[PDB]
């Protein structure tokens, strides 16, 4: 902070690179380097520092910040290429439902079909963590009725002992009936 | 003389109280836990 407060930018970057190489487990120095790069230009050194921070096995809060910084820089191919190794590290239910983020920008039909096939071919063939089916039903209700009645009724092989939830059976029935 | 026994016994408690006790982020000072230990030594000395 004392080096960034002054007009020296070469020594500040050399101190930040040494702090990032000596303390790889620290996250405050990486956040300060990301803030200094956002205060600076949009050169490829910021993307290289982000790739070096992501290659050091970061958490989901750093991956979400990198995805937000990529989405706030008008990047479509670079955001989709950097999202392939994010789902392969943390296979969470919040990360599997956020992997199909290209449908919310240009509606990405082939990419949504590939993401649905990857979500059906992933882990959870018997329970699906009670979160992929509701998102698939919402994506089918927002789109046309191609496979909206199939995955809600004929795909009950991955259900857990009651074929629905307690407060989400009549709601799913009303969502499938009136759409 | 007897001093190595004392130095060893205090340092081993120091090593153990470094490793365990806090178990996360505590380490309540240092001299304090050794002082409670010393008082305990006097307490067992108290017959």
């Amino acid at each position: 902070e004392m080096e960034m407060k002054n007009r020296q930018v070469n020594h500040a970057r050399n101190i930040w690179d040494r702090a990032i190489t000596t303390l790889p487990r620290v996250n405050q120095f990486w956040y300060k380097y990301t803030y200094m790069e956002e205060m600076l230009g949009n050169v490829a050194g910021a993307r290289q520092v982000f790739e070096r921070w992501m290659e050091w096995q970061p958490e989901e809060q750093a991956w979400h910040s990198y995805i937000n910084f990529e989405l706030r820089y008008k990047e479509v191919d670079r955001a989709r290429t950097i999202y392939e190794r994010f789902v392969l590290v943390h296979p969470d239910v919040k990360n599997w439902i956020k992997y199909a983020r290209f449908e919310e920008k240009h509606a990405y039909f082939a990419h949504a079909r590939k993401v649905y096939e990857r979500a059906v071919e992933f882990f959870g063939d018997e329970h699906m963590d009670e979160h992929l089916y509701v998102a698939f039903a919402k994506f089918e209700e927002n789109q046309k009725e191609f496979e909206r009645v199939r995955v809600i009724y004929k795909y009950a092989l991955d259900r857990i002992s009651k074929q629905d939830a307690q407060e989400l059976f009549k709601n799913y029935t009303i969502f499938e009936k009136k759409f | 003389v007897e001093s190595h026994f004392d130095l060893e016994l205090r340092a081993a408690v120091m090593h153990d109280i470094l490793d365990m006790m806090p178990e996360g982020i505590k380490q309540n000072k240092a001299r304090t836990i050794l002082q409670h230990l010393s008082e305990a030594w006097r307490c067992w000395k108290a017959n």
Binding site: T21, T22, L23, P24, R25, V26, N27 | E23, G24, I25, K26
Partner: protein, 84 residues
């Protein structure tokens, strides 16, 4: 075993060459491109006292490679476990 035997021999005894002059030699003493010289060892006679009894020879510098640990990150356990 060879390294330990050499170290034990040193502890028991304690307790040609071709160099190109590529620094300033260009035209002064012209012809020195390899400087082939012989370096022999002086035969020390085994009837001699020691050179000294104490010395202050600085062997090297204490600056080592202080790299990071990279084991894990630091955090806290709980608010109640801190008071416990």
């Amino acid at each position: 075993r060879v390294a330990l035997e050499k170290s034990v021999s040193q502890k028991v005894a304690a307790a040609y060459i071709r160099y190109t002059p590529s620094q300033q030699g260009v035209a002064f003493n012209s012809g020195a491109k390899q400087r082939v010289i012989r370096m022999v060892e002086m035969q020390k006679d085994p009837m001699e006292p020691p050179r000294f009894k104490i010395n202050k020879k600085i062997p090297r510098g204490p600056p080592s490679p202080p790299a990071p640990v990279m084991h894990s990150p630091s955090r806290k356990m709980t608010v109640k476990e801190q008071q416990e």
